[PDB]
Amino acid sequence: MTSIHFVVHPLPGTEDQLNDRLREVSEKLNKYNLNSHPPLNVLEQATIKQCVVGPNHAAFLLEDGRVCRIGFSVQPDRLSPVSLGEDLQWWPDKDGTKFICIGALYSELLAVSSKGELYQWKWSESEPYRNAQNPSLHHPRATFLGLTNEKIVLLSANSIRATVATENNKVATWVDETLSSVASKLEHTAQTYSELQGERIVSLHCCALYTCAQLENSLYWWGVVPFSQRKKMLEKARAKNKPLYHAGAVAFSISAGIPKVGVLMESVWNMNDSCRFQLRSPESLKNEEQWSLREVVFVEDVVPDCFQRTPKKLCIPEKTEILAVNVDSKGVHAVLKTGNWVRYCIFDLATGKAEQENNFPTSSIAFLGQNERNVAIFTAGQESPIILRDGNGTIYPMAKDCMGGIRDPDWLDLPPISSLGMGVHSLINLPANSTIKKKAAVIIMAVEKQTLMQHILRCDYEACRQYLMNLEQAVVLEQNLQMLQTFISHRCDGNRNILHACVSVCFPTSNKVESKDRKANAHFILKLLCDSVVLQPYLRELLSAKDARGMTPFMSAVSGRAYPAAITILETAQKIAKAEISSSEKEEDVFMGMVCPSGT
Numbered sequence: 001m002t003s004i005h006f007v008v009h010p011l012p013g014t015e016d017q018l019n020d021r022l023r024e025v026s027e028k029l030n031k032y033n034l035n036s037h038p039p040l041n042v043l044e045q046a047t048i049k050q051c052v053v054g055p056n057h058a059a060f061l062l063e064d065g066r067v068c069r070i071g072f073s074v075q076p077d078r079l080s081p082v083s084l085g086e087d088l089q090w091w092p093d094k095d096g097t098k099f100i101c102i103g104a105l106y107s108e109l110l111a112v113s114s115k116g117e118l119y120q121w122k123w124s125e126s127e128p129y130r131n132a133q134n135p136s137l138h139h140p141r142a143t144f145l146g147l148t149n150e151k152i153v154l155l156s157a158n159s160i161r162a163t164v165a166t167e168n169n170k171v172a173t174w175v176d177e178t179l180s181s182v183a184s185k186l187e188h189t190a191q192t193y194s195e196l197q198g199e200r201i202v203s204l205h206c207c208a209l210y211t212c213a214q215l216e217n218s219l220y221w222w223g224v225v226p227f228s229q230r231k232k233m234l235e236k237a238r239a240k241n242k243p244l245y246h247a248g249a250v251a252f253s254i255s256a257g258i259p260k261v262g263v264l265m266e267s268v269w270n271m272n273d274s275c276r277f278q279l280r281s282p283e284s285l286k287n288e289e290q291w292s293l294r295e296v297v298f299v300e301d302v303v304p305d306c307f308q309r310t311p312k313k314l315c316i317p318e319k320t321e322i323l324a325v326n327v328d329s330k331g332v333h334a335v336l337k338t339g340n341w342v343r344y345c346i347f348d349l350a351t352g353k354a355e356q357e358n359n360f361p362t363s364s365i366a367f368l369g370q371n372e373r374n375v376a377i378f379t380a381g382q383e384s385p386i387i388l389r390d391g392n393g394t395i396y397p398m399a400k401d402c403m404g405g406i407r408d409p410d411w412l413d414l415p416p417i418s419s420l421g422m423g424v425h426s427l428i429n430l431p432a433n434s435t436i437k438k439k440a441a442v443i444i445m446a447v448e449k450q451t452l453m454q455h456i457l458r459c460d461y462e463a464c465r466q467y468l469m470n471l472e473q474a475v476v477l478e479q480n481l482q483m484l485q486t487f488i489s490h491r492c493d494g495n496r497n498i499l500h501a502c503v504s505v506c507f508p509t510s511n512k513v514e515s516k517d518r519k520a521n522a523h524f525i526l527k528l529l530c531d532s533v534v535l536q537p538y539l540r541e542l543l544s545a546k547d548a549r550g551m552t553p554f555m556s557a558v559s560g561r562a563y564p565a566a567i568t569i570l571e572t573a574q575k576i577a578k579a580e581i582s583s584s585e586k587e588e589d590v591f592m593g594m595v596c597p598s599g600t
Contacts (some may be wrong), residue, residue, distance in 0.1 A: 002048065002418050003038045005029070005445040006082040008074055010437040011383040011424070015399050019410070022395065025445065026412045030457050039084055043068060048446050052157075053423025055257070056123065058444060059109040060419075065098025067111060069121065072442065076430055082442065087292055092128065100354075103157030106176050106259060110162060116151030118142045118164070143599040145172045146190040156206040159382050159424060160259045161186075161223070163211045165201050168192060173211060173218075173223075173471045176281065176465035178259050182252055182299040185307055186224070195220065195311060207327045207381040208254045209297075210349070213311065214325045219347075221332065222311035224297060228304060231271065237303055244268050251277065253291055254382070257368055257426040257439050267295065295329075295382075314352045324389075326377035331355060333377055333386060340364050344388075344398075344406065360396075361408050362548035363588065367391060380424045384441040387420060393448070394493040395420075409548075411493045413457055413504070419446035449496035450490050456501045457492075459513065459521040465528060472534045488538050494548035502526040503557045506565040526565055526595035530572040540576050543569065543594040570595065 005028075007021045018152065028034065036044070043060055050061040057071050074080060091099075097117070103110040111119040116137040120129060131137035142148050150166035163173040170190040170553040196213070210223025212578070225233075234244065249264035262277035271293060279287035300306065316322065320338040327333075331348045342364040348355035359365055367375075368523055369391020378387040388396040392415030397409040397417065412581040426439040471487075474480035492501055498549040506522040509515050529535065535542070543553055551559060557566035577591040 001449045002044055002446045003029075003036060003449055004044055006072075006080045006084075007443045007445070008079065008081055009384070009437045009441045009443065010079065011441055012437050013385075015385045017363075018387070019397050019399060019412075021443075022397075022412050022414065026414045027493060029447070030413060030454070037080075038085070039070070039086070039088060043088070049219075050102055051419045051421030051446070052109060053421045053425075053442050053444060054104050054108050054123075054232065055106055055423070055425060057108060058421070058423075059102055059104070061099055061102040061111075065096075065100075065114065066093060067099055067102060067109070069109060074425070074427060074440065074442070075435070076427055079436075079440075089126070089516075100153070101155040103155055103162060104159075105157055106159060106178065107164060110155070110157055112152045112155045116147075116166065118147055118152060118587070120147075136465050141174060145174060147172055147375060150190060154201055154204050156211070157206050158206045159208050159254055159257065160212060161206045161208065163204055164205050165204055165213075166190070169196050169201060171196065171204075171213070174392065176259060178261065181250060181261050181280075181285075182297075185299060185464040188309070193311065194250070195313070203325065205325060205332075207325045208329070210327070211401075212325060212327045214322060214334045217316075219314045219316060219322070219325065219332065219334070220311040221314060221349060222308065225308050226304060226329075226331075227294060228348075229350055233304055233306070234348075244271060245298065250280075251296055253296040255279075255291060257382070257424040262289075262291075263286075264298070288422075306480075312352065314347050314349075315354070317354075322375045323372060323375040326379050326386075328379040328381050328386070329383070333379065335375055335388075336375065337364070337368070340368075342367050350397055356404070358404070359404050361406055361476075362494065363546070363550050366546065366548040366550075367396070369393075369491070369495060370489065376420075378420050378422055380422045380441055382424055383439070384422055384424065387422070387443075389417060389420065392416060392491040392495060393418070394491070396493070411492070411496075411504075414447065414493055415450050415454065416448045416491070418448055420444075450492075452487050453490050453492055453498055453501055456498055456525055457505060459505055459518040459525070461521045461524045461528075462480075464525050468528065468532055468534065468544055472532070475534055484534070484538070485595055488535075488541070495545075496547055497542050497545050497553075499526075499531060499542045499545075499553040500547055500556055502529060503553050503560065503562055503565050503569075506557070506562040507560045508562070523564065526568055532567060536576075538582065539572065540590065540594060543573055543576070544597065546597070550600055552594065552597060 005025050009018055009021050010538050047063045048060055049063050052059045057069050059069050061067050068088055068090045071085040073083050075335045098114045099111050101112045108121045108123050122176040129138050136214050152166050154165035160176045165171055169192050174187045199215045201213055205212050213220045245268040247267045251260040251264055262279045264277055268275055274290050274292040276288050276290045320336050323335045325334040331346055333346050336343050336345055342360045345354050367390045372391055374391055374393045376389040386398050390396045395414055395417055397406040401407045421444045423442045425442050440598055452467050502525050547556055554566055554569040557569055573594045
């Protein structure tokens with residue numbers, strides 16, 4: 001059980017704006033507590049496994065192998081802001097094909113079945129693709145790709161590019177149908193590479209230009225080289241000789257979130273200066289706009305070769321494991337760990353080495369969390385900012401200080417996020433003379449429904465008391481030990497348990513639902529959690545747990561100027577430590593563990 005939320009972020013902007021939007025959705029979830037949307041209600045009841053945001057639609061892949069699609073639009077003057085369609089259309093399932101991964105394209109969603117089969121939809125079609133000449137034929141390009149005789153296991157896609165890996169370590173990459181002009185130089189059919197051989201492909205990620213593959217201990221990149229290396233190579237070629245490009249040049253670009261293929265009328269003489277292109281409509285294949293040369297690419301008739309076809313490895317340190325990788329315009333971003341010390345690295349394709357390396361201000365143990373497999377990175381690829389997901393499943397804020405480092409994160413109080421999706425979407429039907437930003441990024445959120453912790457963050461005494469009363473009745477019934485364990489291990493952003501949530505919501509706001517009423521209710525909730533019989537065996541575990549800053553609930557109360565809360569936690573700790581029966585354990589040892597644990 002989860003809840004679905006929508007946010008939209010103007011693409012040209014700073015990470016602080018993304019953090020502000022996340023704060024806004026968190027406040028809407030907590031401060032306001034509005035009603036849910038009926039159209040997505042059914043989708044909420046099942047466990048989402050993946051999400052992809054198309055240009056105008058959205059697609060969700062569930063655990064039960066039943067995909068759905070829903071459209072969306074954005075109101076421009078209000079910049080939930082996203083307006084959704086009246087109804088959602090599902091995927092017709094016959095003979096229980098089921099699905100494993102899904103992807104997004106300008107040809108809309110893309111699907112992979114259990115046995116391995118490349119299904120897809122499109123904006124122009126309201127029905128899954130079928131072939132009259134062959135009932136078993138779908139995605140005719142797959143016949144070109146050769147994946148019709150393979151079991152597809154890994155799939156990734158973005159605005160234009162799509163990459164597939166099967167059981168036989170065969171990588172098949174292609175572009176959208178709009179890029180068929182350059183498809184000769186940007187596609188490779190199913191094939192196995194010696195570099196990829198010897199290991200199983202753990203993951204693979206795509207982008208508007210290139211594609212990365214994460215192996216057991218290595219990372220590989222293949223595809224179009226970025227503009228900086230292009231210009232370095234062009235300058236080297238020019239110096240070797242001692243009109244960069246002639247007129248009538250066919251090229252394509254993915255600027256403004258739309259892959260457009262045009263022809264260059266004027267020979268390029270200034271590399272930074274934007275130049276005009278004449279659009280080539282697909283109907284004419286079967287309109288003059290000045291595009292910047294910063295993000296374009298041209299198909300070459302035959303100067304050293306620009307496109308890099310053979311994947312190359314990017315250096316990672318010794319005896320280091322990779323937890324999550326994703327790829328954007330700036331390069332490939334990853335999170336790495338060796339021993340117990342975790343870093344966030346940005347790899348430029350220029351050097352192939354650690355272009356940027358940053359240490360998290362919080363503890364590495366808190367970042368690793370209960371499960372190390374939930375770490376993930378989200379980036380659309382072109383302009384969207386990075387969204388991080390730590391071990392506990394919550395979202396780790398990412399802001400840069402006045403130096404080369406990560407700012408001390410400010411917590412969103414957002415519960416763990418089951419599925420995060422993001423999509424480039426360029427606003428249309430708007431005046432061109434307006435100075436407002438054109439494109440944006442649509443972010444869809446699947447937040448877990450943690451009952452008690454959301455109640456605590458709401459400063460809702462009544463719901464918390466009812467929850468605890470029904471919980472004690474269930475404990476008397478001896479049928480909800482699982483529920484007790486579940487609500488004990490529940491965590492919020494920063495490795496914060498329910499006690500940390502009570503302390504954090506007990507903090508003073510300003511010098512002398514009302515804020516004073518909110519603080520009072522927080523105090524009542526803290527007292528209830530401390531004195532209630534049910535969490536007696538677990539309170540020592542909760543009071544001894546550490547925040548992301550290595551801070552127990554008492555430590556947080558002292559640090560956050562929640563002094564009455566600190567006194568309450570101190571007396572509760574004394575009571576629990578005295579009441580606990582000594583089994584080769586001391587009084588001062590446990591009391592210090594729950595007040596100021598060793599190693600701080």
